Amino acid sequence: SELMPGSRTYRKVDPPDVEQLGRSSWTLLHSVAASYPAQPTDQQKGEMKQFLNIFSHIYPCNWSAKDFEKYIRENAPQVESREELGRWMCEAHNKVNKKLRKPKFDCNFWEKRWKDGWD
Amino acid sequence: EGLSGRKIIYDEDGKPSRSCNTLLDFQYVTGKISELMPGSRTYRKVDPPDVEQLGRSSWTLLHSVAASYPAQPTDQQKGEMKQFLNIFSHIYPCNWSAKDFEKYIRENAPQVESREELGRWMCEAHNKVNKKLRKPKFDCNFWEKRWKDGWD
Ligand SMILES: Cc1cc2nc3c(=O)[nH]c(=O)nc-3n(C[C@H](O)[C@H](O)[C@H](O)COP(=O)(O)OP(=O)(O)OC[C@H]3O[C@@H](n4cnc5c(N)ncnc54)[C@H](O)[C@@H]3O)c2cc1C
Ligand SMILES: Cc1cc2nc3c(=O)[nH]c(=O)nc-3n(C[C@H](O)[C@H](O)[C@H](O)COP(=O)(O)OP(=O)(O)OC[C@H]3O[C@@H](n4cnc5c(N)ncnc54)[C@H](O)[C@@H]3O)c2cc1C
């Protein structure tokens, strides 16, 4: 709300809660999926697996990071194509929605929501 | 300390916690110390995030990652953090920006020995983009207040 000393721009905005961090993490995760190649190289396939493994270790919320890691074991990420990684990212997201009684996102429209837009 | 209130479950760190609890509920505890997408009525059709939206959404995570970082991290956490930033610099959606950030890591290696080192590094990295975009230079001495603790 009110400014920092001694900035004439940056304000005393509080550290993110679950919701502010959540939608910010989802927008990155889904945007990474959208930028993923149709035919990824072995290095890209390896790093995508790594990034998500590390992600589940360091996520700011601790047992949400555990829940995500446990999800990765029970549901291995498909990194063979953008379409698979994106659909997997949507299905991974859909589980958190189910836990929060938020409606299911139609994964048929993940590529519009995160890559293409709607005409 | 309240276990349940306002419908949701409270996570407690040493005591207060921040990242795992909603804003309205966090105040509640610290105060106690004294058109639509087809097939769904719920989700509006939303255009994908632009450079600016993705950018600031990536920063809030990256600094929150620095905020959660331990004071004395294990050797695994140091190496994983290093990889995390490298992989990030490759797979960051904006290619022309990702290549720049990758070059920054080459020239200015991440200091991951402590949270104090990492937040200071992250702030400087953010500040380099700040100068490139002609935004004001953020005071790193206040990164903890902005991203970790709050403003008392
Ligand atoms: C890994 C992870 C674990 C989390 N765990 C918890 C937790 O345990 N408890 C908790 O309270 N919060 C948790 N969160 C935060 C939570 O998931 C939400 O992000 C937060 O509650 C804010 O939700 P929102 O209503 O603003 O929209 P969000 O759920 O953040 O989604 C933002 C936008 O993305 C789109 N979207 C939603 N679902 C999908 C999907 N299936 N596929 C494609 N697009 C979609 C929608 O259009 C929506 O507008 C977690 C977040 C992450 C990233
Ligand atoms: C790795 C990376 C590289 C990027 N490269 C480019 C690029 O090359 N060109 C481009 O146009 N865009 C780039 N972006 C996006 C750009 O940095 C901004 O995020 C975007 O322009 C939105 O700016 P903003 O002013 O709305 O918020 P941001 O500049 O993203 O800042 C968000 C919040 O963080 C806080 N903050 C600001 N500076 C610091 C700091 N130094 N340390 C700690 N906290 C701070 C402030 O409170 C601010 O409200 C990049 C993003 C990332 C994550």
Swiss-Prot record, chain B:
UniProt EC number: 1.8.3.2
Result for mutant: C123S: Reduces catalytic activity 3.3-fold
Annotated GO MF terms: flavin adenine dinucleotide binding; flavin-dependent sulfhydryl oxidase activity; thiol oxidase activity
Annotated ranges, domain ERV/ALR sulfhydryl oxidase: 47-147
Pfam family, one: Evr1_Alr
The entry's keywords: Disulfide bond, FAD, Flavoprotein, Mitochondrion, Oxidoreductase
InterPro entries: ALR/ERV, ERV/ALR_sulphydryl_oxid_sf, ERV/ALR_sulphydryl_oxidase
SUPFAM superfamilies, per the entry: FAD-dependent thiol oxidase
Effect on the protein upon substituting C20S: Reduces catalytic activity 2-fold
Keyword Membrane: no
Domain of life: Eukaryota
Enzyme class: oxidoreductase
The keyword Transcription is annotated on this UniProt entry: no
Compartmental location: Mitochondrion intermembrane space
A single GO cellular-component term on record: mitochondrial intermembrane space
GO term, biological process aspect, one: mitochondrial disulfide relay system
Cysteine pairs bridged by disulfides in the record: C94-S97, C123-C140
Task performed by this protein: FAD-dependent sulfhydryl oxidase that catalyzes disulfide bond formation. Required for the import and folding of small cysteine-containing proteins in the mitochondrial intermembrane space (IMS). Forms a redox cycle with MIA40 that involves a disulfide relay system. Important for maintaining the cysteine residues in MIA40 in an oxidized state. Reduced ERV1 is reoxidized by cytochrome c. Required for the maturation of cytoplasmic, but not of mitochondrial Fe/S proteins.
Protein name: Mitochondrial FAD-linked sulfhydryl oxidase ERV1
Organism for this UniProt entry: Saccharomyces cerevisiae (strain ATCC 204508 / S288c) (Baker's yeast)
Higher taxonomy: Eukaryota, Fungi, Dikarya, Ascomycota, Saccharomycotina
